[model samples]
Target chain A: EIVRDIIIGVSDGLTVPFALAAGLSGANASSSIVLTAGIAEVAAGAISMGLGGYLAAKSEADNYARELKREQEEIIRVPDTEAAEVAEILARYGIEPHEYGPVVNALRKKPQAWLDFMMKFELGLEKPDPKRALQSAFTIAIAYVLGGLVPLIPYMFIPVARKAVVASVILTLMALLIFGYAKGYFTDNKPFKSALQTALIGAIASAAAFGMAKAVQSENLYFQ
Target chain B: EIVRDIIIGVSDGLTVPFALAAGLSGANASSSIVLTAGIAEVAAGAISMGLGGYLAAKSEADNYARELKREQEEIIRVPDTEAAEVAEILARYGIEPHEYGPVVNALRKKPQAWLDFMMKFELGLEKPDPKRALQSAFTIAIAYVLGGLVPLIPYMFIPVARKAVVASVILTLMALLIFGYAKGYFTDNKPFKSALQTALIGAIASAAAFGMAKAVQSENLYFQ
Candidate 1:
């Protein structure tokens, strides 16, 4: 999930800027306007992502808590029935009727454990983790906003409009590469290889868009 | 990081659209135009989010697999040494070094146990999981996309321009509130307040942007 969110975040960081930059760029607007819009987008994007994370995390935790409460109630009200049901499940897993006696006896020693095991194995009541969901959402969103911000920053410093675009690409690519490299560290992959792949993807985005932008078309307009 | 991300995503989702809509209105864009662009923007935003999640998850999984492989190899090659290393590392967490020896010895009796223990303790490796990351990205992307889609829906289906904005606001607030309530469950906080705070941030973004768009005298439009 973390991996997915990170991917989503990074992808958003990459694509949204491209789309946003490309859209504004296509409008034949001034660089300052583009920069302003980008800045606005980034700032807004970051907060929205963060808020989403908090809500998701909170919701998940609440849901899990509620589910656990119900599960507990069921267990309290029906122990033997639940235990016997659990043993039946174990039997299906190749625990013979003879072995089931000892196994069930052992599991019965801890009623909570037995109930939980059954819930997990039979009912599949293992709820989603709220903390992780929140953490994942927040991290992904922020990562994205930060990524999206890369392109906008160049316009703030550079006077030349073309230079700002170039700088945005460079800055964004560098960040993407770094994020890619770090991806390996988090996932236990070949860090350098992952970094290289990520950088390549960013480069592709830039190169393709840059070319498309340069082409003579009805909509191609320069921002000075 | 998670908290920060949630804040950011919500802020962006709410603010960027609101501001853009206001600016478009300021530019004397037709109601239809505002509605069309707004919905497109929001949906685009959501899709971008989903894409971000997919890419980040893909990269993270690659890294995690790499890390797991390294640990697996270490365990396969130096079972006893790895076991000893686990004990050594655990000592840093206030676990007694002497007691660790017995634990290591016991773990060593089972290669699986020893290896698992080594990975957890010495390498700080958790079980590799990529599905969660992907799922996280999916949910967030979907959420954002849905949020983004809101402002435009009424406009798309109805000819009433003002009605669309009103609907958008109401929907946006609802989403933000739910997101906030969820946050309370996962994190240590007041859920209702958090939701409102998050939603308010979104409102602020829209209000600020709309105000600026209105204040601008010329139609040097920021967005298309």
Candidate 2:
């Protein structure tokens, strides 16, 4: 989770803005416009992530309540039928018919426990953990802020436009690598490859923004 | 609905600014920074809310279309089986066997009607009703703006920053109570309790943010 946040923060915050700043530069847009758009993404993303996380958690809690009631009904009605189905389900995974009796006996001893196990093993569902949701949301929001603060960093320290570009790209590329590796670790993909892929995507977006900005700058048009 | 909007507008608008201003104040940030942040929130929140509503509606529309097609396939290929499943579903909800036959027969007479009936009765799902989605989205977006405008309204007329804390809290609480009551009414919940719940939660969040800002500020000074 920490890794996800760090990656999201650095990659999303830094890379997206860098890319936007770069793209806006390309598009002939003013620094002010780029700043506006970049900040928009950060604030908007953070708020959405926070609200979405909360509402999603609430909804999932609701769905679990509904599912639990449904499952309870099945448990109450015809325990034998459900047990037979459970045995058959286990048997499909190399457990012999002889072994089914013992498994069913153990499960029947504790209905709720057995139901919980069935929910996890048989149906591949467990109650949604609200803790995990909160952690993810909080981490993501913080990450976005840290990530988002990056693009603007160059503008703050660097007075020269050329220096700013060089500094921006350098910072973006470095962060992109970190972002990629984190994503790779989570999804079990090649780390370097993922890093490059993410970096490249960010670059493209920034480049596009820059290009649009340049064009807009040339025409003195502010918005699309 | 008007009541809902009035509640939402005040509540949503005040929360953002109240939280931000509180945080800024606790951090010993300049009044200018707090006001700037508040203004930014209004514009940003409205746009985000509008976009969110649009995307949600679009996704719902897509889901509805897919479900409709699935219903069409069932109606065309397996009328009797689908009808039986529907009857079984109805039976669970207390429809007697005698009534189930005539109902299934009536539905089966028209394919479209059968599909619609199954969607409403059997699956308990509805078509995306885009008009409703649009209306809801627009209402929410407008509400967001109205909410956002409130926190900054005082700033426009008065340049003094001394009342920032007082104004923000008042606005936030009022919005919270109103929005809670409005939501409770629509959702068939207790209005006063809901209003109190909303206010309490928002107040807690804002206070926490302010506390964190203070900690961060003090820590910075300690380190220096």
Highest-scoring model, TM-score? 1
**Tens digits of lDDT, candidate 2, A75-105:** 6797887676666655543434654465566
TM-score of each: 0.58, 0.52
Docking class of 1: incorrect
Q: How many clashes in each candidate? A: 59, 30
lDDT of 1 by residue, A88-147 (tens): 765543334654465456555656556665555433444676568767867876777767
- What ranges in model 2 sit over 4 Å off? A1-224, B1-6, B91-103, B121-123, B157-163, B178-186, B215-224
Q: What DockQ results do all the predictions give, each relative to the true complex?
A: 0.13, 0.03
Measured on C-alpha atoms, candidate 1 has an lDDT of 0.57
Highest-lDDT candidate: 2
lDDT of 2: 0.58
Residue B4's lDDT in candidate 2: 55
